[PDB]
Amino acid sequence: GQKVNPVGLRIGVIRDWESKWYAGKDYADFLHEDLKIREYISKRLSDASVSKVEIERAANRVNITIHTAKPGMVIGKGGSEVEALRKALNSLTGKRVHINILEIKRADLDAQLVADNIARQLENRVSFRRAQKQQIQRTMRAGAQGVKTMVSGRLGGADIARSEYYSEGTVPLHTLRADIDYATSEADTTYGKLGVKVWIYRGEVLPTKK
RNA sequence: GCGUAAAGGGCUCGCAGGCGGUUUCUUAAGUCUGAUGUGAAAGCCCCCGGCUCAACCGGGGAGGGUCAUUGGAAACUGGGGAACUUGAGUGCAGAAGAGGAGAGUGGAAUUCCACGUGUAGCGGUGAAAUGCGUAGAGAUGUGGAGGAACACCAGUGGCGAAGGCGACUCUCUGGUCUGUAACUGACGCUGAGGAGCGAAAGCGUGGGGAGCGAACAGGAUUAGAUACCCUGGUAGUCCACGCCGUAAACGAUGAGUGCUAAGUGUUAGGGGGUUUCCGCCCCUUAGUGCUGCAGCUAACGCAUUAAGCACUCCGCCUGGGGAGUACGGUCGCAAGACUGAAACUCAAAGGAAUUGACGGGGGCCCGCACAAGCGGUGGAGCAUGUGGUUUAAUUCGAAGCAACGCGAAGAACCUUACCAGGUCUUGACAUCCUCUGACAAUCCUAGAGAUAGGACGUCCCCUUCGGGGGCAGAGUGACAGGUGGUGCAUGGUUGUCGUCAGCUCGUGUCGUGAGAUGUUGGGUUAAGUCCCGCAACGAGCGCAACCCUUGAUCUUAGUUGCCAGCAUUCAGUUGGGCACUCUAAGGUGACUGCCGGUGACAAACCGGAGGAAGGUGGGGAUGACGUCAAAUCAUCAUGCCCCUUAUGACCUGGGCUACACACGUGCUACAAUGGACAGAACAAAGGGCAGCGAAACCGCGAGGUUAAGCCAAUCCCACAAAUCUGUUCUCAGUUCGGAUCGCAGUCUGCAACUCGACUGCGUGAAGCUGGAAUCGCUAGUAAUCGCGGAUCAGCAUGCCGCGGUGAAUACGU
């Protein structure tokens, strides 16, 4: 029985360590600090869809370089909400963290925003074939080597085993030098927690040196 | 409609009946048409009118007959007469056969008998036994008797209506086909009843009984053997005379006739092309076998021997069970045969084809699977988990591998859910409304404690008063809670099948379809790996590689690490040095690269050099769609149900550790390759600031004291142990082994009695290599000797890594 973290399988060999920091006589305040800031943007992203939240430890000041799909949706009205939740995070963890911003375009190349946004886009009464084919057409048509999205579990109520992993194109699932983006989310409708998991293997980088 | 679904009669001969070659004259009996009669009304239909329309009524029509009487046509069926010849028959000449009936004869072989020869077994089987044999068997030699069947020719050969028919000869007899073509002139085809034949089993009588052989006897195999097997053995098989009249009586296909692609056999003939011959070849019949066009079909398949295409006639079929049963008849000596229902009940039986599964079916292959060796387990004491029994509770979860040294990477209290007791009910944790306050702390008492009372105590960062702001308290319900139930509501996650090599799709084609094809065939690999053919062409996940580690180096770079080359000591320790070792970055290096071949050239495969390393170098990470409603609501989250002044919350003590018993995985032993000591030598890896702890002294001892140093390639943990050199134990429950249990200490903690370990003295169970059975293992492997670490105050015989000693075997499927 196998299944593997694609996002942890390729991490550190071709993928990047999403949490950077020095370490450290006290790794505990770093670990819980990064989890708590990950839930800080996690709570502050009910409608922004920040597809990654990198925080950097910088000698008594965090550099929480929060990425975002749309810039001004979390970037505030020209500096209002970003300074507000930023300073509020400064009095939320204890370190005055000058949180930067990021503009993630190409939503078919963003894993958690496109898949999780497909899931909440399914939570509004959207069907399994309509949600999966619709995400395969928007993000599946957006440009990538292959995106395969499936919403596995409760959908339709009874006889709960439902695995429609509808997705096409090539997939470096076992190609260890592929560097695919593959993260899932969890939608919680009225029938039950019937979440979705999809990855979009955009393309590998050829190894070289000089 | 009838080859396989229900349905071809077992087969023939025939009366009645049903159907019938071509020409020609008549006939109207059918066939068809015209005229009259009659088929009443009401009704159906068409066309109008009347009740406001409609239903309805009325009027006007139509249509309805093997209908009569009667007039025509003569094409077709028929009546009658004349004809003709291929149909069918006779003739003439050929050919052929296990066609039949009766009689006679012949061998090969078995049994039995008589006698010679000879000894101790013969026989049978999977292995044996029953049985036979010293009373002379088997075998072998000779001779005799009797029955039954005829080997070789012999063959999807021949003949027959079918069942069937085989040594050879004779009598009597039927039939088939060929050939011209003398005659006859449709004299034919089918045919319900009726008649007749019909394997083998049976049935009656009388013969015959050599082999075979139900029932029966014995022995074997099995838990059982009224069976399979073996040794015997009655009826029967054989004959003649009579009855039986069933079969998968099969080609599961009734008979007759006409037509419709082809090839290739094979008998029985004929004509012929040259051929004395012979022989080849064509044409031709008749019969029979294969391969196939059209066509048929549900598919398999049939296909000039149709299941095609049409005609004649007979028989059979109307879902399955009930049930070919009952009842009634006919026949039978019987056994039974023919004929042959029903009540109830069910929505399926059934035919073909596909996908998968199965197989104690076959084929090919692989893997510690088996074989080959090593070392174990199951035997002993102990450690842990499970079952069970107990309990107030022995918390919940896992139950074939995949449950059992599992969650547990740590149970004295906490853990903890479970028990007993004392408590509180917006509550231990959170948001919200109001409301006061900065909150709280610090001691005392009572209590084992949670708590309850005091005294001591607290009494803001920002406005210009309204504040803002957490904190705490209260009300106050919205709420909060559940390690409750549902892993068959779930997400997430994880095992195994398994690193085994598969698992699918787009397009195309086939096939009415499901499906298939690719993916199969040929090799080759560990591989659906690669190559080549292929009605397929492509791609996806898998395989591989990419990643890390591991043995070879280069280059960079030398500090705490390394010390050659110099001085230096107890000490790389210290001026010195960066050669070597080592450290982590970039690379390089191995990819069938190269050579000899093998091989359908290709794929791969055998062998060799060279190199540190050779045919995926060694190892790790990586686990395909799917299976198991497999594991988890108790890591977490989550649909529903249920509890809530208690299934919630707080505290003390207990339990999770109990114990007639069975297991599961490991430890330590049973011992001389050993046991005790003395001395010496060899590692690698990781951790260490809430920490490691040097040296010094103290204590046998476990450890205590203080304290340099180390935020660590420097210092500490640290000394490795198995191993080597001497003393000695000497075969025994012991100078082996070690529990149990007692006294006596240390360390950890709020506290070691349930329940931490270690040490001292004493004690010295059981064990002398462990049953049926079962396990892991392909070389730095098994096995074995030690070290470090996660949990963690303490708590390892587990778990995860680390190094040391260093094997045997793989014949083969």
XYZ file of C-alpha atoms (C1' of nucleotides) in Angstrom, chain A residues 1-4 152-154 157 159-161 169-177 190-193 195 208-209, chain B residues 489-492 494-498 540-547 586-587 622-626 629 638-639:
54
model
C 0.000 0.000 0.000
C 1.586 3.215 -1.246
C 0.467 6.811 -1.786
C 3.485 9.195 -1.027
C -12.094 11.339 -3.179
C -14.758 10.234 -0.737
C -18.257 11.307 0.285
C -24.398 10.640 0.273
C -22.045 4.137 -0.385
C -19.306 6.611 0.409
C -16.512 5.201 -1.763
C -1.680 14.441 -19.576
C 1.712 13.292 -18.361
C 2.464 13.053 -14.646
C 5.872 12.744 -12.961
C 4.437 10.994 -9.916
C 7.350 8.539 -9.691
C 9.878 10.514 -11.778
C 11.982 11.656 -8.835
C 13.505 14.653 -10.668
C -23.620 19.109 4.176
C -23.300 15.388 3.397
C -19.822 15.113 4.882
C -16.190 16.090 4.587
C -12.410 16.783 -0.003
C 23.382 21.346 -15.113
C 26.413 23.083 -13.625
C -21.570 8.256 6.895
C -16.602 10.106 6.089
C -11.826 13.107 4.952
C -6.969 12.314 5.910
C -1.549 3.070 6.633
C -0.871 -2.436 5.739
C -0.688 -6.652 2.290
C -1.290 -8.909 -2.802
C 4.419 -6.722 -3.892
C -0.780 7.468 -19.398
C 0.656 5.373 -14.697
C 3.942 1.450 -13.689
C 9.668 -0.790 -15.035
C 14.141 1.832 -15.487
C 16.990 6.232 -14.749
C 16.955 10.929 -12.274
C 17.817 11.537 -5.624
C 32.249 21.158 -7.910
C 33.354 17.501 -11.300
C 10.407 5.535 -4.536
C 5.113 1.056 -3.852
C 0.136 0.936 -10.812
C -4.980 0.837 -11.442
C -7.614 -2.358 -7.973
C -17.200 -2.551 3.300
C -16.092 15.715 10.354
C -22.855 13.898 8.752
